[PDB]
């Protein structure tokens, strides 16, 4: 009846306790199996699937042709990036190299949704969702990364599994990262870590990555988004990274992306 985080024999993706049993549920575009535990890819845009650059990574490009930020696909017709990024230029174009060299796919952004509680001064809720004029053709043109439900992310992914911080060189480059608790990280970065941000230890400075880069974590054959990289303290030269805690924005994603 309880969801066992210690074990591997329960749900593949998300779990929900109660009664004298537990109801499993799946990530975006996955069917719940006949055994009521496994999640099988159903739709064409089954999230977080890799193979053997990254299906969900995209660059943000301006009218002059200059790339300025990174972003990650989270739905068929939606890219997530920081608010700062989305407000730098009036006309932004998303582009991706996935399954293309000198011929990247360009897609115009029809609408920009800055978080309703974004505050530039404090730097709180620094995200925006960009609606694409035309949907991505899954899986060939691209794929969205999975967005995890809150408890799953904060008890199964982040504290237990090693992560990957991937993005574009500030001036695709991927490195492993691991969790550091707020008390320590605050003192290293000389800031106060909020409940909607958290820290990753990195073997390289934060300025290595562009704003809009992301931290991801694999789980039972699927990649989940756990962090977005935005404004870094102390110049972004510290070997810790402050990322936005994506697990806290699940309701906002639904409210916006379901129209």
């Amino acid at each position: 009846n309880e969801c066992h985080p210690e074990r591997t024999d329960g749900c593949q993706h998300f779990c929900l306790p109660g009664q004298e049993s537990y109801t499993c549920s799946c990530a975006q575009g996955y069917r719940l199996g006949e055994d009521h535990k496994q999640c099988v890819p159903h739709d064409q845009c089954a999230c977080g699937v890799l193979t053997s650059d990254l299906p969900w990574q995209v660059k943000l490009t301006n009218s002059e042709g200059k790339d300025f930020c990174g972003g990650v696909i989270i739905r068929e017709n939606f890219v997530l990036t920081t608010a700062k990024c989305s407000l730098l230029h009036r006309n932004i174009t998303v582009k991706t190299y996935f399954n293309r060299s000198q011929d990247p796919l360009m897609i115009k952004i029809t609408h920009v949704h800055v978080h309703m509680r974004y505050d530039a001064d404090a730097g709180e809720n620094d995200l925006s969702l960009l609606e694409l004029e035309w949907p991505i053709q899954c899986p060939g043109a691209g794929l969205p990364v999975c967005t995890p439900e809150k408890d799953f992310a904060e008890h199964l992914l982040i504290p237990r599994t090693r992560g990957l911080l991937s993005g574009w060189a500030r001036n695709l480059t991927t490195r492993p990262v691991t969790l550091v608790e707020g008390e320590e990280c605050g003192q290293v970065l000389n800031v106060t870590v909020t409940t909607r941000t958290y820290c990753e230890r990195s073997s390289v400075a934060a300025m290595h990555w562009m704003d809009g880069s992301v931290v991801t974590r694999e789980h039972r054959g699927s990649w989940f988004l756990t962090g977005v990289l935005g404004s870094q303290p102390v110049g972004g030269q510290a070997h810790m990274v402050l990322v936005t805690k994506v697990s806290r924005y699940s309701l906002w994603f639904k409210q916006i992306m379901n129209a």
């Binding site: 309880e2 969801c3 066992h4 985080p5 998300f14 779990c15 929900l16 306790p17 109660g18 549920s25 309703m116 509680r117 505050d119 001064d121 404090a122 709180e124 439900e149 809150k150 408890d151 799953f152 008890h155 199964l156 106060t192 909020t194 409940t195 909607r196 806290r248 924005y249 699940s250 309701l251 906002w252």
Partner: protein, 385 residues
């Protein structure tokens, strides 16, 4: 007061309540940036206390407070009509013997500053804020003395509010509020039992769970996926309990909490005979509010550039150093002797409706006539404070 002035006062009561609850929801979102756990404070108590500081403030120091509390739309013929608004409302809360509320505030002011008696008397008479001169340079004595005052007024329920005092301190504002109410329909302690409570989807704990049967008002927001349940108190006050559907994030709703949303819930309420399972709990929370208030645009008064020269002429250099609120709320079975309502029979295809509060929830305690939000809170674990 005059005829048109009395008109203004009562007319402005609704507006004051609406704005103070939006002030409350805004402050909730600030507190949530630093705290995930149990949470309770008083929007009314904060607005009352901060409005008291306007008596001495002039210029932007004053104006920012008024905007920060969402009160700028109120335009009184005499400046003193805004304090009289607060005086009327807090006295009505006091007069309610039935309401088990204790509230007060202190302004601890460094002994260098000659506090003008106009501020001294008006702060007490309108806001019941007691101005008490303090020698902060002897920090350990100031701590003992300040803690004595709060000890006295709370009758020992808050025996040591202060742990540390900066000897550089200029002014400390303290607001305290303690509440334990009596339900209009009580829970029967014979049916209070130890049930499971989901701290989250991967963590359970055992808690005392109260059981209530009878007519209750409730509704279900189909957009945000949450149940809203009214638990009325004796003394013309009500707790709204907001329970998110099982797979949802209670913290996520806080970004959408507005006076308008609450009003939409309230007029969509339907009353029916049902069963309510609700945990006993006690919360005791203190916050350093000045940094949170800074983020809501109340800034100049917490800076060396503050103008509280009306509050005192003496110099170098009157500002507010800290603003504290400590809030104590307790919930148990006790209520007035109501006759128990009949539930509908259990048949082969149905049984009475049920709301089971066995996971984290928000609550709001409102005064009914005014709509003033006395307490705004969140319980994530009812076995701790």
């Amino acid at each position: 007061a005059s005829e048109e002035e009395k008109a203004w006062l009562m007319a402005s009561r609704q507006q004051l309540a609406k704005e103070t609850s939006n002030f409350g929801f805004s402050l909730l979102r600030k507190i949530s940036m630093r705290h995930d756990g149990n949470m309770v404070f008083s929007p009314f108590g904060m607005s009352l206390a901060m409005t008291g500081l306007m008596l001495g403030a002039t210029g932007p120091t004053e104006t920012q407070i008024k905007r920060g509390l969402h009160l700028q739309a109120l335009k009184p013929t005499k400046p003193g009509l805004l304090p009289s608004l607060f005086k009327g409302l807090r006295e009505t809360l006091s007069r309610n013997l039935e309401l088990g509320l204790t509230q007060g505030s202190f302004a601890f002011i460094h002994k260098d500053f000659d506090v003008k008696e106009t501020f001294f008397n008006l702060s007490k008479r309108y806001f019941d804020t007691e101005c008490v001169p303090m020698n902060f340079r002897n920090a350990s004595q100031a701590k003992r003395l300040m803690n004595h005052y709060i000890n006295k007024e709370t009758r020992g329920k808050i025996p040591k509010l202060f742990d540390e005092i900066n000897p550089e301190t200029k002014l400390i504002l303290v607001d305290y509020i303690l509440f334990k109410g009596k339900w209009l329909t009580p829970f029967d302690p014979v049916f209070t039992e130890v049930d499971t409570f989901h701290l989250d989807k991967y963590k359970t704990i055992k808690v005392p769970m109260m059981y209530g049967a009878g007519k209750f008002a409730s509704t279900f927001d189909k957009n945000f996926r949450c149940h809203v349940l009214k638990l009325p108190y004796q003394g013309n006050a009500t707790m709204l309990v907001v329970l998110m559907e099982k797979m949802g994030d209670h913290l996520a709703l806080e970004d959408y909490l507005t006076t308008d949303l609450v009003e939409t819930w309230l007029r969509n309420m339907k009353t029916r005979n049902m069963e309510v399972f609700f945990p006993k709990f006690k919360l005791d929370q203190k916050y350093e509010m000045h940094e949170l208030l800074r983020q809501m645009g109340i800034r100049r008064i917490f800076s060396p550039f503050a103008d509280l020269s009306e509050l005192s002429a003496t110099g170098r250099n009157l500002q507010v150093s800290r603003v504290l609120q400590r809030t104590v709320i307790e919930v148990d079975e006790r209520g007035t002797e109501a006759v128990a309502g009949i539930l509908s029979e259990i048949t082969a295809y149905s049984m009475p409706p049920v709301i089971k509060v066995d996971r984290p929830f928000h609550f709001m305690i409102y005064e009914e006539t005014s709509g003033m939000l006395l307490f705004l809170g969140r319980v994530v674990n009812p076995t701790l404070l």
